[PDB]
Each structure stands twice: as C-alpha cells, then as structure tokens.
Design a protein around this ligand. Structure first.
Ligand SMILES: [K+]
Ligand SMILES: [K+]
Ligand SMILES: [K+]
Ligand SMILES: [K+]
Ligand SMILES: [K+]
Ligand SMILES: [K+]
Ligand SMILES: [K+]
Ligand SMILES: [Mg+2]
Ligand SMILES: [Mg+2]
Ligand SMILES: [Mg+2]
Ligand SMILES: [Mg+2]
Ligand SMILES: [Mg+2]
Ligand SMILES: [Mg+2]
Ligand SMILES: [Mg+2]
Ligand SMILES: [Mg+2]
Ligand SMILES: [Mg+2]
Lengths: 82, 177, 80, 114
RNA sequence: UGGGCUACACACGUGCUACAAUGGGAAGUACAACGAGUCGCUAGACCGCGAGGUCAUGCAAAUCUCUUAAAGCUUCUCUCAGUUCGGAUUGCAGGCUGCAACUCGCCUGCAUGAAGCCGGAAUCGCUAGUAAUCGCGGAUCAGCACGCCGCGGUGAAUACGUUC
RNA sequence: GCGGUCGCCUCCUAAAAGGUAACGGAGGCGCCCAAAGGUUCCCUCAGAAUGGUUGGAAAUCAUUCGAAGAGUGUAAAGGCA
C-alpha cells in the first residue's frame, strides 16, 4: 500500500471543502470528483456526492468508513445479472 | 460428592435467603439429569446408533436405554418401533458427579466457548443444554469417534420458576452468557 | 443398579495441567498413571488442558486488546 | 490437545502444530524456538512440560475461533458499509482486482455450462 | 475531471503453476552466454524477517555495476498423506513508483490454505545440441509480462517405410 | 334381452321391543395370530405449549396442559381408560 512516510492522501480542495464545513451543526452535501481521496476522521457526519462517471452518488460517511478511499463507495459499473 | 456438599452447605442457605423460603424443603434441587443422544441416522446405518450408544455409555457410566420411534413417519422411515436415539438417566451421586464434570471440565473444552444460553429454560424451572459436539468429555478418546455427534442434557429440578432454576444452576456453577 | 451391564466406573482425580488445580470425580476413563489424594487415598490421575479455574470465560480475564476503532487505527497508523 | 484441535500424533511437532488454525510454518517454528523444543521430535513423544510450555506460548497468540471471528467480522464490516470489497464478498466475485471474464472459479464456484 | 477499454450466468483459443518421492523442505558447494547502464547500473557498510530503506562507492564502461544464474552435485529431514504436495482465495500489516494504486499496479511478511490424484471425444510441436527442462538479459517502461525477442546450462527417444 | 346381482357380517331405511321390502342408501368377508391365547403382576393414551445439536411441521429427550378427542389385526355398529 501507500508508504507510511507519505501519510494519508486527500485532495487539498476536498480537504478545504470539509474544513469549511467542520463548524456546521447541519452539514450540506459535498460534491466531488476526487474518488482518490481518503476518508479522514473529520469526514464523519458528512455526505459526499462522489462522481461515479455519470452522476454524483451521495455517500454518508460514518466513522466506520475511515481509512477507505471515497470511490470504494461509488461503484462505477452497473451489473444486474445476465 | 463435592458438588453435593456445595449444594447442601452453601447453596441451600443462600437460596433460602434469596427466595424467602419458609421451610428448607422448598429449596430447589436437581432431581435428575436425562442425557439424550438423538440418532436418526440409525435408519441409514444401525452401526451409527451402536457407536453413539457406546459413546454415551462411556460418558455417563451407565448403559443407555435405546429408544424407538413411537410413531411411524415417512421422511424418517420407521414402521413404528425401529431403534432411533438413546438416553441415560442419572440421579443422586452419579448425577452430581456427572454435573460437576460437566461444569468443571467438559464445557471448558467446548470450541470457542462463550458460556451457555440463558433462555434455554422450559419455563417451569427445568433447564436443557444442547451439546453440538462430543469429544468435550474426556472419556470419548477423540479417536475412536468416527462421526461427531451431539446430545441434549436435560437438568430437571424441583424449582417452580426459571428464576429459581437459574439461581440454583448458577450457584452450582453454570457459565451463563 | 443392575450388575454386569454398565461400563466400569471408578473414582478418579483430574487436574488442569495449566494451573495444576486438581479434584476428584467419577469417570469410565482410566490412566496408566495414578496419584494420591486428600483424606488419604489413591486414585488414577487424568490430565486435562483446561478447567473452570483456567478457562478465560470462567476467569473473566481476557487475553486480547478488545479490537480498536477504525478512527484510532487511522490515527495510530499515520501518527495523527 | 493444544487449542482444542487434535494435531496429528505421529507428525513432527512443527507439522502437527501447523494444523492449528492461525499457525503456519513460520509461526510454529517461532513458538518452538521460543519454548526451546527441537522441531524434529514427534508430538507423541512430547513430555507434559513441553506440551504445557507450547500451550502457554500458543495462548499468547490469537488462534482458532477468535481468529475466525475476527476475520469474519472484518468481512462483515466491509459488507455492511457496502464498499466495493463488501459487494465482491457478497456476490462471490474476486475482490483484489482479478479479471472475471474468465477464471475466477475460486470465488464463482464450479462452472455452470448453462 | 471522472469513468470505461480490467464487466461476467457462460463458449472457445494461447500460456503459467500444479496434481508429487526422478519429489517437498533444510544446509553446503560449482559451471554460462546474450545484453543494459547518467541521472542511469549501482559496489561496500548499516538498518529491516523480507519487500526494501539510509550512508556511500566505481562506471558513459573488455576497467565499475546489473551479475556468486538455475537446473547441477554432497549430506540431513520428510515417507505416499489432498500430505511437510499444491498455491488459488481471503484477512491483516507493509515496501516502492507516481500528484494519485477504490474502480485499477507490482512486490514483501504473518495468517488462510481452494480445485487439482495426470485428464473423454479430439488435438498439437518436434528428426539434435532438437524436444523436454533450467535459468539470464533486453525492447516497450515513472511503476506494472506466466507475453515477445534474444542468450546460454543440462539434455534424451525415435525414423522399418510411403499403404493410408 | 344387454348390464348388474345370487352365500355371510355391520349401519341407515326400520315408524324408541323383536322382525320387516325395493335392480333402496353405504361398506366389508371367503382371513389373521404359536401370540395378536390363558393367567400373575405392572402401566395409561391422542395431541398442544415451551425448552433442547445434527433435526427441519413432524424422528429422540424433558416439564405442564391434557377424560379420551387415542388404541382396540381386519368393514361398520355397539363396547371397552
Ligand atoms: K477486474
Ligand atoms: K480463458
Ligand atoms: K500465460
Ligand atoms: K530431497
Ligand atoms: K490501481
Ligand atoms: K492436460
Ligand atoms: K520495467
Ligand atoms: Mg495452520
Ligand atoms: Mg488486473
Ligand atoms: Mg480522460
Ligand atoms: Mg482489451
Ligand atoms: Mg497423490
Ligand atoms: Mg525436417
Ligand atoms: Mg327396532
Ligand atoms: Mg317399532
Ligand atoms: Mg386385543
């Protein structure tokens, strides 16, 4: 995996977006294309609309999801069986 | 005999205090232990029933009663009376010794053991513990066994309520979850 | 109790080899080894791995870290 | 025997131990080295002292039922958060990026010619 | 910018690993060739179980490095077991490259331990340093090959004959 | 004529004794058991609820409820705890 020295990754613009909303009793959807961004503890309680290629699927970030990339919750392919 | 001494000396006064019993006779006691090995596989092969009987006999120290299908069934295939299942009845000293072994050795040897159920009471103060797998008893020898089988151990007591039964069994030693 | 049908049943002392706690009960199993006992008697000795005096559930004492929340895991992994 | 699993009595101690869930060759060698037991001795010939030391060393580890519970808990957590990994676990598809057009038998099951 | 070309009830091509004892594991010891290298090949030392990391050294090279090759040979162990075979799958923890490894890289460690007991009809390559087998290097290439190109090590059986 | 039936047992018809017909309404029999007979002793069921490993509606086990709702070789009626 990613080297420890590098530390966790999150797109700076997305991190700024969450920072601006840290002090919000009622948070608002955070729209992003940055699937690569990791889920930090500060992300909990937010709802991030991750672009899946054609639409922004909302993902509610619970504290259990930290450590995972955002795209892990926005499947890019749709398959309903043959 | 050690468990009997525990019951007579420490358990009895404590139960009397807790349940405000006018007379010592009201103290619940473990009347009997019926250990039943349900063997429906006997129909497919009787040797399985024979080995189950042998194992249960080794566990209990007594020859089991080989029960028979009291009714005829289609999917279980006994023109009434075929020998499916066995049981043993323990009372007195043998019962107390077996219960002591159960609490102190056999149960600890259960794989990933996290106690025993606490809703497994009949509602009249009689408990029943379902052993999934044998080999927890040291007598089984863990190699003569070819098919792992379980059992149902029914502890029948004189308690009138599951509360009293649970108290009695806990005091006698029962790893309730 | 009927004679000659039941398995041989003799007294026996068993020990939790982990802690050495021993005590007496009856069993159909025997051993090529024996030991003395209180009250001044000798019984066959049965070795056991675990008993109520050593099993973790009986003792209550755990043996692991009880897991760690994922937020704590993240902070520990990345020194945050 | 050691962890509630009757290790083969006639195998060398390392091989016998490997039968314990959560113990591999390296782990068995490590525990034997720590205890001070030669690896070539068959388990049947182990003395009670050796067996007790081995039991203590193993108990120091997480093995068998607890290990299975932990791994299953991780998989269940993935499923319940509903990640891509969780969905792969749910539908029995490869979870580590393997191609599924062919192969993937280990997860899919035996081929259904239909 | 993101996703897809990496999908997946299935069908078919080409390969790799296997199904074991002519073998697995452990330890010791020997013999190549073709090629590549400047911000690249990197010595030696130290750290780390390993992937690798740090310091640092020679070399634009018959000079230094990749590069002490693997099969091989000498001992020890294992004893026919779906196993000390197998290495799929999965969990955890890591190393790199890159701004970035979820879709969707490779590699390492611990754990796990899948089908598989030599394969129906049918079908393929090969007449000698060939097949089989064993490694080594290179191109593309930040990183990513069981594929391709090339190199050498060991190294056989068979050909009566042209009816089909 | 063709079809059906012909002997014996049970019920309804059958009109509260008995008996009573129809090509009236329903079923059985042409055996079985060496115990499924006699006696002495002993025992009481069917299901339901709850609890319990394989085991599921339902196999075996335990407790309570349970007067017959079972069983009585073989049809029915009567009778039998
Ligand atoms: K894929
Ligand atoms: K294929
Ligand atoms: K291939
Ligand atoms: K060998
Ligand atoms: K990737
Ligand atoms: K083949
Ligand atoms: K490369
Ligand atoms: Mg193992
Ligand atoms: Mg891939
Ligand atoms: Mg694009
Ligand atoms: Mg393509
Ligand atoms: Mg084989
Ligand atoms: Mg030719
Ligand atoms: Mg009349
Ligand atoms: Mg009249
Ligand atoms: Mg009769």
């Amino acid at each position: 995996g990613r080297s420890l020295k590098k530390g966790p990754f999150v797109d700076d613009h997305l991190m700024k977006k969450v920072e601006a909303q840290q002090g919000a009793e009622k948070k608002k959807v955070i729209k992003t294309w940055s699937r690569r961004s990791t889920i930090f503890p500060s992300f909990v309680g937010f709802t991030i609309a991750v672009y899946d290629g054609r639409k922004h699927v909302p993902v509610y970030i619970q504290e259990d999801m930290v450590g995972h990339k955002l795209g892990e919750f926005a499947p890019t392919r749709t398959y309903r069986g043959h | 005999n050690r468990l009997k001494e525990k019951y007579i000396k420490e358990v009895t006064p404590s139960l009397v205090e807790k349940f405000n019993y006018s007379s010592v006779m009201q103290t619940p006691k473990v009347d009997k232990i019926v250990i039943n090995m349900g063997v429906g596989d006997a129909v497919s092969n009787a040797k399985n029933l024979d080995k189950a009987v042998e194992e249960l006999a080794l566990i209990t120290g007594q020859k089991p009663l080989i029960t028979k299908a009291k009714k005829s069934i289609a999917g279980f295939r006994l023109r009434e009376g075929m020998p499916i299942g066995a049981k043993v009845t323990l009372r007195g000293e043998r019962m107390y010794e077996f219960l002591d072994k159960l609490v102190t050795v056999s149960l600890p040897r259960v794989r990933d053991f996290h106690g025993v159920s606490k809703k497994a009471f009949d509602g009249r103060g009689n408990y029943t513990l379902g052993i999934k797998e044998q080999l927890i008893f040291p007598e089984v020898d863990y190699d003569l066994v070819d098919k792992v089988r379980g059992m149902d151990i029914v502890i029948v007591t004189t308690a009138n309520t599951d509360e009293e039964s649970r108290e009695l069994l806990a005091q006698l030693g029962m790893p309730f979850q | 109790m009927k004679q000659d049908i039941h398995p041989n049943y003799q007294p026996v002392v068993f020990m939790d080899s982990t802690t050495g706690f021993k005590f007496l009960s009856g069993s159909t199993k025997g051993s090529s080894e024996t030991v003395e006992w209180e009250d001044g008697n000798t019984y066959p000795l049965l070795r056991v791995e675990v008993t109520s005096d050593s099993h973790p559930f009986y003792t209550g004492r755990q043996k692991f870290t009880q897991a760690d929340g994922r937020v704590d895991r993240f902070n520990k992994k990345y020194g945050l | 025997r050691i962890a509630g699993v009757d290790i083969p009595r006639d195998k060398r101690v390392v091989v016998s131990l490997t039968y314990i869930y959560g113990i591999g060759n390296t782990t068995a060698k490590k525990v034997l080295a720590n205890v001070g037991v030669s690896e070539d001795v068959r388990v049947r010939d182990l003395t009670n002292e050796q067996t007790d030391a081995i039991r203590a060393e193993i108990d120091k580890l997480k093995v068998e039922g607890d290990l299975r519970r932990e791994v299953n808990l991780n998989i269940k957590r993935l499923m319940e958060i509903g990640s891509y990994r969780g969905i792969r676990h749910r539908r029995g598809l490869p979870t580590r990026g393997q191609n599924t057009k062919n192969n993937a038998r280990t997860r899919k099951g035996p081929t259904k010619t239909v």
